[PDB]
């Protein structure tokens, strides 16, 4: 499957904030569809499905802090 973990932080910075989980994990999805948002030092990025398929479940919550190589969630075998 695919595990989704949490981007490098520079020195400045040394941990994260998750931005927004628009979709919960245990539904649908499609490929080309936003998916949950990350927060940066200043600039809040996207994080879109590379395919549909079913997801695992989302350990952070939003409005939390995120360390590099921090397991959000997994994806499901999809099919």
Known sequence: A???KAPT???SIADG???TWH???GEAVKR???IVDIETDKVVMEVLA???GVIAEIVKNEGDTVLSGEL????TEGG
């Open 2 to 4: 695919i595990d989704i």
């Open 23 to 25: 979709k919960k994990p």
């Open 9 to 11: 932080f520079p020195e």
């Open 72 to 75: 959000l969630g997994k994806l």
């Open 50 to 52: 590379e395919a549909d």
């Open 32 to 34: 080309d569809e936003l």
């Open 17 to 19: 904030t998750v931005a």
